[PDB]
């Protein structure tokens with residue numbers, strides 16, 4: 312089903328169909344690391360968690376991080392045999408491509424090389440970004456996990472005007488659901504479920520199946536497998552509580568929720584196992 | 586990178602360096618945009634990464650096709666479909682005789698189809714001007730140059746300010762709106778529509794304030810009734826002179842009743858009330874070009 316209201320700029324079922332049909336073009340493999348026998352799933356978590364901290368330092372948007380995450384996972388599905396010393400170059404170059412796509416004034420190249428502690432030069436990043444984009448067939452416009460959460464939050468707070476393009480939702484509850492998704496994305500087994508399913512399952516744990524189905528269009532049976540998989544991650548967030556909305560200098564308060572944050576969730580990921 | 590021979594330079598501008606190339610074995614002609622990466626300290630330009638990713642998912646008959654992206658030496662080649670002329674040259678060549686009304690209607694209809702396709706794919710063009718509208722010798726017109734384009738989310742957030750060339754920039758951009766979306770492309774197309782009819786730019790301003798006043802002198806100085814929230818916009822000033830809205834019988838004399846109606850809805854001050862590309866296709870101005878498809882009322 313389609314949760315979007317009647318759209319004045321296009322057919323509501325047409326816009327939603329295109330968004331759904333796009334996910335058929337972008338493929339994800341939850342076991343792409345089997346193509347790289349020398350790598351381990353925990354290495355992917357450490358890299359993504361490091362990219363989260365890099366985004367918060369330069370105040371990059373959450374969309375920028377999840378773009379780099381999707382670029383990283385899809386590029387690895389096309390490659391074979393990667394050493395751990397090459398992971399940092401692929402990760403920071405994915406963030407470099409993502410920053411230039413999403414940010415109005417992205418950081419310069421040398422800043423991306425600066426955060427690598429000299430392990431990645433500027434020319435290495437420029438070489439890596441071309442190999443990433445060419446291997447991905449220049450398919451660099453996916454619907455990230457956080458993009459779906461942005462859609463689900465707008466539909467949850469729709470009025471009689473049905474204006475779905477003007478953002479209107481509480482920022483504090485948004486960053487709480489994104490906090491759960493930031494943990495689940497560290498586990499490589501999340502790729503088994505589509506990005507739209509993961510975002511809807513995280514919203515369900517902070518609300519209900521009725522609100523989930525109203526704003527996502529997916530029935531409870533579609534996300535039950537994802538919800539049951541997300542079960543350990545949700546309680547670890549519930550045991551420690553939810554974070555507060557932060558303020559960033561130079562960033563307007565009406566956009567502060569869109570800035571990527573990072574708290575030490577390393578031990579939070581291992582508590583979800585078993 | 587072979588089998589292609591440069592025939593003529595098409596142009597050098599914000600897009601890059603465009604050449605006309607022709608395949609020697611097949612006779613196929615293309616447009617090659619050359620990007621010399623040795624001069625780009627930030628790697629592939631952001632406008633290049635944006636345009637490539639957007640066009641590889643915007644396959645439409647009224648959108649200039651990106652055929653291939655070739656990385657040869659320290660350069661990046663973008664292979665485009667070739668069209669022989671842009672709309673601005675065609676309007677200037679037709680300035681004395683005037684573009685025939687059926688051709689104006691056909692061109693606007695195709696432009697609205699390509700624009701409705703972009704907007705349904707959640708993509709804003711943000712630089713619709715006659716120089717970016719290309720025509721072939723078979724009656725087709727296509728949208729080109731997506732370097733300033735951006736995919737918008739649902740809901741949108743604050744995007745880049747001061748977009749669109751000045752003559753075709755919507756009034757909400759000139760007044761410093763925080764959010765914007767598909768309405769800015771419709772305004773540009775409305776300016777292009779009137780320019781085809783009158784063979785002259787509708788609002789040829791030389792500054793941001795002069796552009797806004799030229800719009801005010803034609804459509805009237807807007808107020809809260811015609812545009813709710815206009816007096817609260819950052820660049821709005823209570824000292825704006827009060828001009829009366831001009832009768833479209835003088836703004837676009839050759840335009841009939843259905844034409845003036847469509848143009849009025851494309852030039853509505855309120856972006857929320859401005860007609861959409863999809864709705865414009867259903868306007869009675871195109872009642873002879875297209876027929877309504879049966880709608881499932883389920």
Ligand SMILES: COc1ccc(CC(=O)Nc2cc([C@H]3CC[C@@H](OC(=O)NC(C)C)C3)[nH]n2)cc1
Nearest residue numbers: 594595600616665666667668669670671729730
């Ligand atoms: C010297 O002789 C000439 C021959 C033909 C022209 C018109 C033309 O531009 N044809 C194209 C262009 C194209 C592509 C090249 C990049 C894209 O366009 C732009 O981003 N910028 C354009 C609007 C300049 C589409 N495909 N076909 C002009 C002069």
